[PDB]
Symmetry: C3
Subunit: 147 residues, 3 copies
């Protein structure tokens, strides 16, 4: 079937917040990447893993995956930073509805308040003075029919 990895090496200032008002809309957080994938197989799943290096002053990080054409996220996850960079992750298994190429958008933002930096320290400076890499991968798998 399919495997696709999408590295994200850009630094992103995510000043877009996630709130109870915007969480089920398209307005929450800040987009950090877009990814187009095509299932090879009927009846398959995409196992999606976003593993994002992020910093913020003490608080929560929200990640939201949006299928282009939908009006709200199809998966939402949560991370944390104390001030120092931490891996913030989203895992989901999406049931595929055909063989049409589909574009997903990943958005990142503070839980209710605060600015989140992706691939940087909490002030936007390079972590350890270098370029860092976050990753979003899509792995197509066939789920087992359980007897």
């Amino acid at each position: 079937k399919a495997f696709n990895n999408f590295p994200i090496t850009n630094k992103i200032q995510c000043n877009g917040l996630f709130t109870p008002s915007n969480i089920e809309t398209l307005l929450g957080g800040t987009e950090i990447g877009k990814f187009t994938v095509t299932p090879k197989s009927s009846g398959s799943m995409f196992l999606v893993s976003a593993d994002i290096i992020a910093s913020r002053m003490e608080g929560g990080v929200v990640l939201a995956l949006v299928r282009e054409g939908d009006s709200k996220p199809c998966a939402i996850s949560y991370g944390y930073s104390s001030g120092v960079p931490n891996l913030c992750s989203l895992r989901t298994s999406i049931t595929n509805t055909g063989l049409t190429p589909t574009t997903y958008s990943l958005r990142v933002g503070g839980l209710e308040s605060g600015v989140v930096w992706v691939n940087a320290l909490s002030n936007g400076n390079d972590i350890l003075g270098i370029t860092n890499t976050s990753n979003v991968s899509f792995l197509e798998v066939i789920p087992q029919t359980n007897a």
Copy 2:
């Protein structure tokens, strides 16, 4: 080769602690899911990933995977929450014996003290006012 994903969306208050006296028993934590998988290949392994949204007042979260029929966990992992929700994960490779369906239970609880809420804020409220989703997946693979 078998694959299955098991979403978990209930808000669950995990009052069961993990302690040095219960960690090698079936009594630690609070069960948050139970899953039955069937290997298609003999001598395979399951790559298991539990990714659980959890909150607790400042402290450690423990995750334990228990194979039904065993007397203690076959895998143990650790997570953290400051009070705000955070993903707490267990990732392991588990050996399969034969082709019969096998049932696994996932337990979550505080490291030695504290209450852990799964899929909720530390007071049991909905995170961002919505239903939230945790996942446990099993991917069958042939080891080298």
Copy 3:
């Protein structure tokens, strides 16, 4: 091909990661070495390191080094408040042949601080038992 490499020892990771050593081989403490051989050409390895780590309040750094290189090919970040927490590295590396290749995983403090792997910050067993961190290599064919 799938290969899993469990790491069970209690390891004091006293080697720091600093701006001066991050792009060298000198950062961190090696916690494991893994030799894998791609079965298919054009393939990638999906690498997942999930390491139980503790330190006094602060950042944990993880670096994967491929034998022959002068610096890490993947770097990730974790956190501990003083109690053990899973610190992870995820990456996809492109395979270049069908010959065995050796990788090294190093863990250390972000700029300062001792990190313990598979242990409390004083080197005691967590919950009084042996604990397990894992590094796996799953060979897959890309698009």
